[PDB]
């Protein structure tokens, strides 16, 4: 899909 | 858990603000960080966030570019630095935890609040 | 980004009564989904996250429900504690975090 969302994940794991 | 913002206050259009958050009784270099604001109509939206090594910074949309979210982990405290500030973002200011999960960003402790209001 | 709508968005109760707030998300956002409640001055307090997992210290008076697009926050029995502002928060991956609007309980008289 070329209109598939290109962009990274905000809501990805930010803690260690 | 403690979480305090300062530096809030008046500022003109278009000049800029840096906000602090102090963390006390937590691991705090351990810890994703987020900033999220209340404008005056009650709506909360989310600002930012900072993973816990800085590896990683997302912002809301409507201050992509203009705000910068940073952490000094060797004195617990989180930053916000705000430039080009309009009207729109005239609000209180909080800090917040997240939770630490994996798959649950969401905000378990929160500091009282500071509030910016832009105006001349 | 997604829309967050509750429903509605003041609701009268008296205390003891059985109550429920919706919140509609404009797309899926699976069970990443959080509710908080604000009184005024003060600021969120945590009560459900991934739509149904009730926080540790809040009354197990509070439950949520709910998937993809339609999702609940019910009051077993509403204390007089809570007569609050509560909010649904997505945290849906790919997607920028969303409040609601709020829903405000209110006193019936």
């Known amino acids: 899909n070329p209109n598939a969302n290109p962009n990274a994940n905000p809501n990805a794991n930010p803690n260690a | 858990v403690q979480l305090v913002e300062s530096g809030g206050g008046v500022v003109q259009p278009g000049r800029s603000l840096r906000l602090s958050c102090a963390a006390s009784?937590?691991?705090?270099?351990?810890?994703?960080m987020h900033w999220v604001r209340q404008t005056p109509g009650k709506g909360l939206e989310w600002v930012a966030v900072?993973?816990?090594?800085?590896?990683?910074?997302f912002y809301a949309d409507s201050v992509e570019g203009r705000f910068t979210i940073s952490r000094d982990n060797s004195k617990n405290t989180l930053y916000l630095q705000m430039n080009s500030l309009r009207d729109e973002d005239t609000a209180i200011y909080y800090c917040?935890?997240?939770?630490?999960?994996?798959?649950?960003?969401?905000?378990?402790?929160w500091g009282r609040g500071t509030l910016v209001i832009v105006s001349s | 980004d997604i829309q967050m709508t509750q429903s509605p968005s003041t609701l009268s109760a008296s205390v003891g009564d059985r109550v429920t707030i919706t919140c509609r998300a404009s797309?899926?956002?699976?069970?990443?989904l959080a509710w908080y409640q604000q009184k005024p001055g003060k600021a969120p307090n945590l009560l459900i996250y991934?739509?149904?997992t009730l926080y540790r210290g809040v009354p197990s008076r509070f439950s949520g429900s709910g998937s993809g697009t339609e999702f609940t926050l019910t009051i077993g029995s509403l204390q007089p504690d809570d007569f609050a502002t509560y909010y649904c928060?997505?945290?849906?991956?790919?997607?920028?975090?969303?409040f609601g609007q709020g829903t405000r309980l209110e006193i019936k008289r």
């Open positions: 917040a935890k997240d939770w630490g999960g994996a798959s649950d960003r969401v905000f378990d402790y």
């Open positions: 900072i993973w816990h090594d800085g590896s990683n910074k």
């Open positions: 797309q899926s956002v699976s069970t990443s």
């Open positions: 009784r937590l691991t705090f270099r351990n810890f994703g």
């Open positions: 991934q739509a149904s």
């Open positions: 928060q997505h945290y849906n991956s790919y997607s920028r975090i969303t």
